[PDB]
């Protein structure tokens, strides 16, 4: 056990910092700024296809 | 006695603060300004002078 020596270590600060990001995107006008698709064909996420 | 050397001396602060409003209450020159700060019709720019 390996019951609380790691659970106090890693398993507790997971929920706190994820709350600090879900309460962050709706407030700050620049959230995560993820880039473009980089897609060579045309796929089902769009309606058209490419050869 | 009741230790006037002690905390009676920091009690002079509000003794100074009671005198600290005498200068402002004779600085009652201008109400009619244009920084709103206007003293238009309200009992809010009149107060705390």
């Amino acid at each position: 056990r390996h019951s609380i020596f790691a659970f106090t270590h890693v398993l507790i600060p997971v929920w706190i910092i994820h709350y600090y990001l879900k309460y962050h995107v709706t407030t700050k006008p620049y959230t995560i700024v993820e880039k473009k698709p980089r897609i060579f064909p045309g796929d089902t996420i769009l309606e058209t296809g490419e050869v | 006695r009741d230790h006037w050397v002690h905390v009676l001396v920091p009690m002079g602060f509000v003794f100074g603060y009671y005198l600290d409003r005498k200068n402002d209450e004779k600085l009652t020159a201008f109400r009619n300004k244009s920084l709103l700060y206007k003293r238009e019709l309200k009992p809010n720019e009149e107060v705390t002078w």
Binding site: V14, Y30, K36, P37, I39, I45, L46 | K33
Partner: protein, 173 residues
């Protein structure tokens, strides 16, 4: 929150992963387990505050000012009219600072979006941002009268040089 016209970006356009292979991939084991170990300690407590934060409301109000004089009033050695004009001009400058910060991150919206092309596209932010900051240091940046803050006594007089020497001493414009 905010208004989307202030911060525009094109829509997201996320494609399909296209596995195509019968080999076992680890991405079908990660998203199917880790989502519930986050939603339970976060979202329910976020809901528990959501009913508790709606117990009472508190108000804070906008501050809108009053601007009766603008520039040319008044006479030289005065004090009264030349104090409100300072409150005019100086609060007409700290507005003009953070307007540029909107347009600065507007450039940053394009650059970390495309990335690959990033120069030959977006059609505005290399132009329009340079149609602001170029139209900024002239007559609104007291170069180098910004130390004494140039309060109504040099910000008009750069604009005296912007009308006397400029546009008439071009011989003959």
């Amino acid at each position: 929150s905010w208004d989307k016209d202030v911060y525009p970006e094109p829509p997201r356009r996320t494609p399909a992963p296209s596995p195509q292979t019968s080999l076992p991939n680890p991405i079908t084991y990660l998203t199917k387990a880790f989502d519930l170990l986050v939603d339970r300690p976060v979202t329910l407590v976020r809901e528990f505050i959501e009913r508790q934060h709606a117990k009472n409301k508190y108000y804070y109000y906008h501050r809108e000012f009053r601007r009766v004089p603008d520039i040319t009033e008044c006479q030289e050695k005065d004090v009264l009219c030349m104090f409100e004009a300072e409150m005019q001009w100086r609060r007409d400058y700290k507005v003009d600072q953070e307007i540029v910060n909107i347009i600065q991150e507007r450039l940053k919206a394009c650059q970390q979006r495309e990335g690959e092309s990033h120069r030959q596209n977006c059609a505005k932010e290399l132009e329009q941002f340079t149609q602001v900051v170029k139209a900024y240091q002239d007559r609104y940046h007291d170069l180098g009268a910004h130390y004494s803050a140039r309060k109504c006594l040099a910000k008009q007089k750069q604009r005296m040089l912007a009308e006397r020497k400029a546009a008439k001493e071009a011989a003959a414009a």
